[PDB]
Amino acid sequence: MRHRDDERQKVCLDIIYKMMPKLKPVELRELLNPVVEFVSHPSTTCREQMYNILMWIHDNYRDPESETDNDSQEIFKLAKDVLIQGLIDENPGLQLIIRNFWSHETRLPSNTLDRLLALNSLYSPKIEVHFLSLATNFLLEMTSMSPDYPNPMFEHPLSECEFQEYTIDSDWRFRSTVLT
Amino acid sequence: MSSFEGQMAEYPTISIDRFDRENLRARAYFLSHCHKDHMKGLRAPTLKRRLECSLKVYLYCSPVTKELLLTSPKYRFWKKRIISIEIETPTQISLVDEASGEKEEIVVTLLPAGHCPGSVMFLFQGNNGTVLYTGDFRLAQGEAARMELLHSGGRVKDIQSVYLDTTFCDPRFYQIPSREECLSGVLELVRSWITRSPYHVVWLNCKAAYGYEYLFTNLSEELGVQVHVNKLDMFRNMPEILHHLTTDRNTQIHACRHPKAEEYFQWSKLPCGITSRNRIPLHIISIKPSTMWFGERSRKTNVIVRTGESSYRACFSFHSSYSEIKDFLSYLCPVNAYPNVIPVGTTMDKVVEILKPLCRSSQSTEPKYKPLGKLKRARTVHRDSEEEDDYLFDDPLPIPLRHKVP
Amino acid sequence: SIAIRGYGLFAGPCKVINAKDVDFMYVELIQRCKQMFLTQTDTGDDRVYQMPSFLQSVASVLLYLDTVPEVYTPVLEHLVVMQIDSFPQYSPKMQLVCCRAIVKVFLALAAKGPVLRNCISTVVHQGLIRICSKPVVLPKGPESESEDHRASGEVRTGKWKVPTYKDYVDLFRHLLSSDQMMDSILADEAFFSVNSSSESLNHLLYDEFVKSVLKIVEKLDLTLEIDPAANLHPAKPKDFSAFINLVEFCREILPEKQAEFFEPWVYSFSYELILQSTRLPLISGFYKLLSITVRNAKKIKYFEGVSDPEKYSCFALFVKFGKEVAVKMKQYKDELLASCLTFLLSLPHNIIELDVRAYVPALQMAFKLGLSYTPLAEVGLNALEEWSIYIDRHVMQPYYKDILPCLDGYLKTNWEVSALSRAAAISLEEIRIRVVQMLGSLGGQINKNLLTVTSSDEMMKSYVAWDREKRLSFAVPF
Amino acid sequence: MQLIHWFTNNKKFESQDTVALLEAILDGIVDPVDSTLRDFCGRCIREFLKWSIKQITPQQQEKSPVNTKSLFKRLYSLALHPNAFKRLGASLAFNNIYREFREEESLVEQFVFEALVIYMESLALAHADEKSLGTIQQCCDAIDHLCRIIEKKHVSLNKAKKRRLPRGFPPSASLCLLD
Amino acid sequence: LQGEADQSLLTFIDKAMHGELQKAILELHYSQELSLLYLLQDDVDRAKYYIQNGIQSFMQNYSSIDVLLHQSRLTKLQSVQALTEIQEFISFISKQGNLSSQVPLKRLLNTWTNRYPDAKMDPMNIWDDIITNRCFFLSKIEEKLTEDISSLIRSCKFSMKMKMIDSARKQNNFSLAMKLLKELHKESKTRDDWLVSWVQSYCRLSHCRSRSQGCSEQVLTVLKTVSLLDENNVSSYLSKNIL
Ligand SMILES: [Mg+2]
Ligand SMILES: [Mg+2]
Ligand SMILES: [Zn+2]
């Protein structure tokens, strides 16, 4: 796998993804230690398989209390870290896949305040330049599921409105005269 | 020429296009094409004596190269030791030692070169990485991205070294026209000449033995006339080329060769002994396809130039130009790159410093920290004798005391 | 060539020279050169590589006869012109051979009489005209000779690109510095050491180049015909192109030989350029030539100790012209304003000391435009360094608070110990380095003006709120 | 264009938004560097005058030319400025709005003599300028436009009505063409 | 730099620069100190490399400070003169034509004696840094060569030291001024004009000091000046110099 070859590493990751559902925690950990090295790989097809492997690991190692053997914990931590790093992937399609994986209702709540609370867990010292943009996107994507979202922001058009004349020469007028 | 010593730095047990001095100990021989500058030592008496004393050493080449090589009577002793390999077919070669039973497997891939009948590339893959040997190739700009076997999943493979052809690796040969343009020009000229009378003939002063078959075949297909050559039995198994050549001297287009053909043409006589048919004199024009002559011009020139009343020159190169070489090497982006041949004008250092910015050497490092110890002054030469008046100035500041111990 | 050398070596000491055959061979050589190079306008693949030998033989013959036929003087002048034109078509050694041939012809013409010394003047003028007739060098390569627009049937091998003025600069430098070449010419043939050996050929050619430049300048028609600065077109675009090429060639040639021979030409050249510039204030080549002239004058200390009357007249002329340019340049644009600022900042410190207030806005505009255009920044840095070095400190003191704040824009464009402790045309970078070195060279009493309270008050305007109350209340719909 | 249409239907003399838009356009039209912005601001002043006339009844515009008065007073302030670019901008604004200004009888009767005197003074001030700027040409074009406007409607200008008193004129209760 | 000998700092830098963490902060905030240490070890190439690194670090730091922080920008700008003088000395000591004659040395001394910090707006740390660097540079120059050049160097050092004492007096740094005057008292008596200048500087310092004191202490602090002022041995020099 360490050898630089796109097709070879791709079929290696395929073999790993196919043999993963029948591996032991220690074996899975010592086999995932080199798998996470594809986060900085130029090929956009090997990173996809690595992210598939990591999403499978995340979905099949959610249990934090049960199945506690000090190996599943580290595997889950590493998988979560690399999945978080995958939020700034160069490929827009792969980044969209990763953000749709994270934006699911199982991993991020649908309530606004609950999602704001949970977004702090998606932080890592790796994604710091883009953390604010990702958080704002995750917060604003919940607006589409709102009744007022497709409605117009203002009822009447300018064709039937009143032109507001600021006739009151209040303290604002002194500043407007001082300005120009 | 070929400045290659027929020995890669990664795989010294195999020799390519050179069998002269140290290649007599090699375990496998490779032949790019059938040019004489790439066949030094192939007919040596020492190599002849070695072949009859070994059984596991072979000569790998293209099938067309094998056909062109076995035709010559001087090289027919290789008939039982040549193994032809198809292009674009990754095969495994066994580098078994003769004396000891040691063995070593390597994967070679033959890629087309577009130079002459049988010219191919060699792409080796073994324990010491991937190396590429493009011996006398010809690629236009934007064609390196179309080689299937040089790509692994849509990206260029990791190549460790490239022994590329640097025949025209100099700013003199900036952009040589494609061979189709020269072909069209020569076709138009020969048509406009021979279309007048059946006694107008056209000579083709071709210096190289192989490489001009494209011109011959296309002229024959576009004019219906058959080119005359000295020998054509070498193409007996190549129907698409054999049916365009003829040994008869009663044809208009000629491409025969002779060491003293220049004086013969000056006397209005082709290299073949015939000078006139039916006692009617022949009107001969000479077209010499070459490239080195165009690389010395001082102003704007054309593909088909006229250097005399019955003399012409054509820009027909089977070697990649400077821009094409730069594009190819920049697209491959290898770790190293070694020039196989040095140009006549250029030298080794200039070709090396031209090829170096194209190699994948994008790794810099800060200089090593030079330590500074044992300062260059031992005794305090700047010490005072401490004689003062002590009354013009205020009292000295008392030495501080710090008892904090963290 | 063998026959000419033998005839020389024989009829020299033998004293058998007869004009009835020397003129014969002279006419023969001239007619052969005319029918081979001038009239025969075809594919002369080898003729150019053998023209220098013909020129050397023609010069060796011409130096012998005393009655030169006046009908064969044009053919000769035009022949030397066309030989000069073919200079870029030579190898680095063939170029030296061509230079030797030209110097030999000039030496053969500078010994007969004034009627043939005028031939040197006219051949230099025609060669300069031919060089200026070349196309203008564009910033990037022309679309015809571009990277990947090679037309069908075009072979770009050897010297395939059309020559420009930049290819004759080496020829003219060799001509203006032909001293060891003259020694090689004279020491070859025995008769060359007998006639007049003009060691001042360099000064002669320099004066001829200067007067030819003047004649070309006073001959062109730089008139513009038809928001207002957009529909303006040159009446004769070829004249405009020739003027640009002439300005560039002057920039390349004039500072040769440390501007030694340019001292007597300072006043006349400056007056002619200033007249052509005040009659055509929208041409930047005049300002470029004036900048070149002022730099060449400063190189030879022409204005040092001015405060002959010609030096003072030139000083008083430049003093008024600088004021006029500074006053009228307030409405120019990118190229014209750049050239005007370059000229105004190229002036010596003696003129600046008279009134620094008039030239401070020019330096400010140069520093402001240097953010995008690096050469203006370089010119401004050089001018500021010259002013800080040579102008009196008490005069420059009240102007640093206005000059230096303009240099702050270059400095405004990561890790620190507080983080690593927890962890346990020149480029713009060269301009920034020069600005830092400029601020350091100025003492602590001067560089403090980079940060003035007025600059801070002006820069604090981009940090105040547009409105002091929130107006646009948008409720995000969840 | 739609913003100019919307901010030109005010009813009071100096509306904050209308004055802000007019000042922005008049500061863009006097830009010494950019010419495209200057032409676009000329078009904007044209649309400003057009939709200030288009969004008011003729009986009300004769009573109080709200936006026309502000525009003309600002053009007069720009035409007498010592800076050449502001005078050039005022001349360009008039050369852009003369075709819409002459289609209103009351606007002409009220502003034509004042504009003529102001632009004559501007052409006089433009004496010390250069011919490459273009202030002389634009000012002469504006003066020719005003001259044609006066020639076509000279029958109504010969009467002694109460018009706007131009600059440097003695106080009077009427203004005719003889003055 | 003042001439002492202690391998503490050199061993400390050697131990620190051999670590990925310590070296990365030593090359960032103390590159000028590293350049000076390499100049002390007669390593001109490394010194020039580190002074260029220091120029780049100053540029990076100054480009990151906010515009509204005027005091921080001024404090960062107060080191450009020292950095540029270090780079200028590195460039001067590199060429060989400067060690043959004394014209370039006199030019350098004239450029230094006309480039001083602000006497009242630059704090005493900038003055101390610049004067110490100039003295170290002059010492290194004198160390290569061996009215000769040594007397010129001594006169330049004395003049710079006196200018620094004047600047310290003008900034109410009376203790530092006294400490710098006491160090120059010995060498000022070697020549004749140096003694008069030293006595006059001491008297000016005692006058400036006698303003924020009581009337009983002013008399005491100024009584020490009359004996130095009306001295009779320098009367020969005073009778020939009217200033
Ligand atoms: Mg070959
Ligand atoms: Mg070949
Ligand atoms: Zn034949």
Side-chain angles (χ1 to χ4, degrees), chain C residues 88-133:
Chain C
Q89 302 181 5
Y90 289 112
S91 66
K93 291 165 292 301
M94 286 299 301
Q95 286 184 355
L96 268 301
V97 174
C98 164
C99 296
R100 282 189 62 259
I102 297 175
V103 172
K104 187 180 185 302
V105 173
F106 284 166
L107 291 177
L109 292 178
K112 312 299 295 181
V115 298
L116 295 188
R117 295 173 113 269
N118 184 30
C119 300
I120 300 180
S121 177
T122 185
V123 73
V124 168
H125 186 198
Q126 293 297 142
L128 193 56
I129 285 289
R130 189 69 56 86
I131 293 173
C132 295
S133 62

Coordinates of all heavy atoms in Angstrom, one line a residue, chain C residues 88-133:
Chain C
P88 N 22.4 40.7 -37.6 CA 21.9 39.6 -36.7 C 21.9 38.3 -37.4 O 21.7 37.3 -36.7 CB 20.4 40.1 -36.5 CG 20.4 41.5 -36.8 CD 21.4 41.7 -37.9
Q89 N 22.2 38.2 -38.7 CA 22.3 36.9 -39.4 C 23.7 36.2 -39.3 O 24.0 35.4 -40.1 CB 21.9 37.0 -40.8 CG 20.5 37.6 -41.0 CD 20.1 37.8 -42.5 OE1 20.9 37.4 -43.4 NE2 19.0 38.4 -42.8
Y90 N 24.5 36.6 -38.3 CA 25.8 36.1 -38.2 C 26.0 35.4 -36.8 O 25.3 35.6 -35.9 CB 26.9 37.2 -38.3 CG 27.0 37.8 -39.7 CD1 26.6 39.1 -39.9 CD2 27.5 37.1 -40.7 CE1 26.7 39.6 -41.2 CE2 27.7 37.6 -42.0 CZ 27.3 38.9 -42.2 OH 27.4 39.4 -43.5
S91 N 27.0 34.5 -36.8 CA 27.4 33.8 -35.6 C 28.2 34.8 -34.7 O 28.6 35.8 -35.2 CB 28.2 32.6 -35.9 OG 29.5 32.9 -36.5
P92 N 28.4 34.4 -33.4 CA 29.1 35.3 -32.6 C 30.5 35.6 -33.1 O 31.1 36.7 -32.7 CB 29.2 34.5 -31.2 CG 28.0 33.7 -31.2 CD 27.7 33.3 -32.7
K93 N 31.1 34.8 -33.9 CA 32.4 35.1 -34.5 C 32.3 35.8 -35.8 O 33.0 36.7 -36.1 CB 33.3 33.8 -34.7 CG 33.7 33.2 -33.3 CD 34.2 31.8 -33.5 CE 33.1 30.8 -33.9 NZ 32.0 30.8 -32.8
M94 N 31.3 35.4 -36.6 CA 31.0 36.2 -37.8 C 30.5 37.6 -37.5 O 30.7 38.5 -38.3 CB 29.9 35.4 -38.6 CG 30.4 34.2 -39.3 SD 31.7 34.5 -40.5 CE 30.9 35.7 -41.6
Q95 N 29.9 37.8 -36.4 CA 29.6 39.2 -36.0 C 30.8 40.0 -35.7 O 30.9 41.2 -36.2 CB 28.7 39.2 -34.7 CG 27.3 38.7 -35.0 CD 26.4 38.8 -33.7 OE1 26.9 39.1 -32.6 NE2 25.1 38.6 -33.9
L96 N 31.8 39.4 -35.1 CA 33.1 40.1 -34.9 C 33.8 40.4 -36.3 O 34.4 41.4 -36.5 CB 34.0 39.4 -34.0 CG 34.0 39.7 -32.5 CD1 34.3 41.2 -32.3 CD2 32.6 39.4 -31.9
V97 N 33.7 39.4 -37.2 CA 34.3 39.6 -38.5 C 33.6 40.7 -39.2 O 34.2 41.6 -39.9 CB 34.2 38.3 -39.3 CG1 34.7 38.5 -40.7 CG2 35.0 37.2 -38.6
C98 N 32.2 40.8 -39.1 CA 31.5 41.9 -39.7 C 31.9 43.2 -39.1 O 32.0 44.2 -39.8 CB 30.0 41.7 -39.6 SG 28.9 43.1 -39.9
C99 N 32.0 43.3 -37.8 CA 32.5 44.5 -37.1 C 33.8 44.9 -37.6 O 34.1 46.1 -37.9 CB 32.5 44.4 -35.6 SG 30.8 44.0 -34.9
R100 N 34.8 44.0 -37.8 CA 36.1 44.3 -38.3 C 36.0 44.8 -39.7 O 36.7 45.8 -40.1 CB 37.0 43.1 -38.3 CG 37.5 42.7 -36.9 CD 38.6 41.6 -37.0 NE 39.8 42.0 -37.8 CZ 40.0 41.6 -39.0 NH1 39.1 40.8 -39.6 NH2 41.0 42.0 -39.7
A101 N 35.1 44.2 -40.5 CA 35.0 44.7 -41.9 C 34.4 46.2 -41.9 O 34.9 47.0 -42.7 CB 34.0 43.8 -42.7
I102 N 33.4 46.4 -41.1 CA 32.9 47.8 -41.0 C 33.9 48.8 -40.6 O 34.0 49.9 -41.1 CB 31.6 47.8 -40.1 CG1 30.5 46.9 -40.7 CG2 31.1 49.2 -40.0 CD1 29.3 46.8 -39.8
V103 N 34.7 48.4 -39.5 CA 35.7 49.3 -39.1 C 36.8 49.6 -40.1 O 37.3 50.7 -40.3 CB 36.4 48.8 -37.8 CG1 37.6 49.6 -37.3 CG2 35.3 48.8 -36.6
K104 N 37.1 48.5 -40.9 CA 38.1 48.6 -42.0 C 37.6 49.6 -43.1 O 38.3 50.4 -43.6 CB 38.4 47.2 -42.6 CG 39.5 47.2 -43.6 CD 39.7 45.8 -44.1 CE 40.9 45.6 -45.0 NZ 40.7 46.5 -46.2
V105 N 36.3 49.4 -43.4 CA 35.7 50.4 -44.4 C 35.8 51.8 -43.9 O 36.1 52.7 -44.7 CB 34.3 49.9 -44.8 CG1 33.7 50.9 -45.7 CG2 34.4 48.5 -45.5
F106 N 35.4 52.0 -42.6 CA 35.4 53.3 -42.1 C 36.8 53.9 -42.0 O 37.0 55.1 -42.3 CB 34.8 53.3 -40.7 CG 33.3 53.2 -40.6 CD1 32.7 52.9 -39.4 CD2 32.6 53.4 -41.8 CE1 31.3 52.8 -39.4 CE2 31.2 53.3 -41.7 CZ 30.6 53.0 -40.6
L107 N 37.8 53.1 -41.7 CA 39.2 53.6 -41.7 C 39.7 53.9 -43.2 O 40.4 54.9 -43.4 CB 40.2 52.6 -41.1 CG 40.0 52.3 -39.6 CD1 41.0 51.2 -39.2 CD2 40.3 53.6 -38.9
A108 N 39.2 53.1 -44.1 CA 39.5 53.4 -45.5 C 38.8 54.7 -46.0 O 39.3 55.3 -47.0 CB 39.2 52.2 -46.4
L109 N 37.7 55.0 -45.5 CA 37.0 56.2 -45.9 C 37.4 57.5 -45.1 O 37.1 58.6 -45.6 CB 35.4 56.0 -45.7 CG 34.8 55.0 -46.7 CD1 33.3 54.8 -46.4 CD2 35.0 55.4 -48.1
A110 N 38.0 57.3 -43.9 CA 38.4 58.4 -43.1 C 39.8 58.9 -43.3 O 40.4 59.5 -42.4 CB 38.2 58.1 -41.6
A111 N 40.3 58.6 -44.5 CA 41.7 59.0 -44.9 C 41.8 59.7 -46.2 O 42.9 60.2 -46.5 CB 42.6 57.8 -44.8
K112 N 40.8 59.6 -47.1 CA 40.9 60.2 -48.4 C 40.6 61.7 -48.4 O 41.5 62.5 -48.8 CB 39.9 59.5 -49.3 CG 40.0 58.0 -49.3 CD 41.4 57.5 -49.7 CE 41.7 57.8 -51.1 NZ 43.1 57.2 -51.5
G113 N 39.5 62.1 -47.9 CA 39.1 63.5 -47.9 C 37.7 63.7 -47.3 O 37.0 62.7 -47.0
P114 N 37.3 64.9 -47.1 CA 35.9 65.2 -46.6 C 34.8 64.7 -47.4 O 33.8 64.3 -46.9 CB 35.9 66.7 -46.5 CG 37.3 67.2 -46.4 CD 38.0 66.2 -47.3
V115 N 35.0 64.6 -48.8 CA 34.0 64.1 -49.7 C 33.7 62.7 -49.4 O 32.6 62.2 -49.8 CB 34.4 64.4 -51.1 CG1 34.5 65.8 -51.4 CG2 35.7 63.6 -51.4
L116 N 34.6 61.9 -48.8 CA 34.4 60.5 -48.4 C 34.2 60.4 -46.9 O 33.7 59.3 -46.5 CB 35.6 59.7 -48.9 CG 35.7 59.5 -50.4 CD1 36.7 58.5 -50.8 CD2 34.4 59.2 -51.1
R117 N 34.6 61.4 -46.1 CA 34.2 61.3 -44.7 C 32.8 61.6 -44.5 O 32.2 61.2 -43.5 CB 35.1 62.3 -43.9 CG 36.6 62.0 -43.9 CD 37.4 63.1 -43.3 NE 38.0 62.7 -42.0 CZ 37.5 62.8 -40.9 NH1 36.3 63.4 -40.7 NH2 38.1 62.4 -39.8
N118 N 32.1 62.4 -45.4 CA 30.7 62.6 -45.3 C 30.0 61.2 -45.6 O 28.8 61.0 -45.2 CB 30.2 63.6 -46.3 CG 28.8 63.9 -46.2 OD1 28.1 63.8 -45.2 ND2 28.2 64.3 -47.4
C119 N 30.6 60.3 -46.3 CA 30.1 59.0 -46.5 C 29.9 58.2 -45.2 O 28.9 57.5 -45.0 CB 31.0 58.2 -47.5 SG 31.2 58.9 -49.1
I120 N 30.8 58.4 -44.2 CA 30.6 57.8 -42.9 C 29.4 58.4 -42.2 O 28.6 57.6 -41.7 CB 31.9 58.0 -42.1 CG1 33.1 57.4 -42.8 CG2 31.7 57.4 -40.7 CD1 34.4 57.5 -42.0
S121 N 29.2 59.7 -42.3 CA 28.0 60.3 -41.7 C 26.7 59.8 -42.3 O 25.8 59.3 -41.6 CB 28.1 61.8 -41.8 OG 26.9 62.4 -41.3
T122 N 26.7 59.7 -43.6 CA 25.4 59.3 -44.3 C 25.2 57.8 -44.1 O 24.0 57.4 -44.0 CB 25.4 59.7 -45.8 OG1 24.2 59.4 -46.3 CG2 26.5 59.0 -46.5
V123 N 26.2 57.0 -44.0 CA 26.0 55.6 -43.9 C 25.6 55.3 -42.4 O 24.7 54.4 -42.2 CB 27.3 54.8 -44.3 CG1 28.4 54.9 -43.2 CG2 27.0 53.3 -44.5
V124 N 26.1 56.0 -41.5 CA 25.6 55.9 -40.1 C 24.2 56.3 -40.0 O 23.3 55.6 -39.3 CB 26.5 56.6 -39.1 CG1 25.9 56.7 -37.7 CG2 27.9 56.0 -39.0
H125 N 23.8 57.4 -40.6 CA 22.4 57.9 -40.6 C 21.5 56.8 -41.2 O 20.4 56.5 -40.7 CB 22.3 59.2 -41.3 CG 21.0 59.8 -41.2 ND1 20.5 60.8 -42.1 CD2 19.9 59.6 -40.4 CE1 19.3 61.2 -41.8 NE2 18.9 60.5 -40.8
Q126 N 21.9 56.3 -42.4 CA 21.0 55.3 -43.1 C 20.9 54.0 -42.3 O 19.8 53.4 -42.3 CB 21.5 55.1 -44.5 CG 21.4 56.3 -45.4 CD 19.9 56.7 -45.6 OE1 19.6 57.9 -45.7 NE2 19.0 55.8 -45.7
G127 N 22.0 53.6 -41.7 CA 21.9 52.4 -40.9 C 21.1 52.6 -39.6 O 20.3 51.7 -39.3
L128 N 21.1 53.8 -39.0 CA 20.2 54.0 -37.9 C 18.8 54.1 -38.3 O 17.9 53.6 -37.6 CB 20.7 55.3 -37.2 CG 20.0 55.6 -35.8 CD1 20.3 54.5 -34.9 CD2 20.6 56.9 -35.3
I129 N 18.5 54.7 -39.5 CA 17.2 54.7 -40.0 C 16.7 53.2 -40.3 O 15.5 52.9 -39.9 CB 17.1 55.5 -41.3 CG1 17.2 57.0 -41.0 CG2 15.9 55.2 -42.1 CD1 15.9 57.5 -40.4
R130 N 17.5 52.4 -40.8 CA 17.1 51.0 -41.1 C 16.9 50.3 -39.8 O 16.0 49.4 -39.7 CB 18.2 50.3 -41.9 CG 17.9 48.9 -42.4 CD 16.8 49.0 -43.5 NE 17.2 49.9 -44.6 CZ 17.9 49.5 -45.6 NH1 18.3 48.2 -45.7 NH2 18.3 50.3 -46.6
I131 N 17.7 50.5 -38.8 CA 17.5 49.9 -37.5 C 16.2 50.3 -36.9 O 15.4 49.5 -36.3 CB 18.7 50.1 -36.6 CG1 19.9 49.4 -37.1 CG2 18.4 49.7 -35.1 CD1 21.2 49.8 -36.3
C132 N 15.9 51.6 -36.9 CA 14.6 52.2 -36.4 C 13.4 51.7 -37.1 O 12.3 51.7 -36.6 CB 14.7 53.7 -36.3 SG 15.9 54.4 -35.2
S133 N 13.6 51.3 -38.4 CA 12.5 50.8 -39.2 C 12.0 49.4 -38.8 O 10.9 49.0 -39.3 CB 12.9 50.8 -40.7 OG 14.0 49.9 -40.9

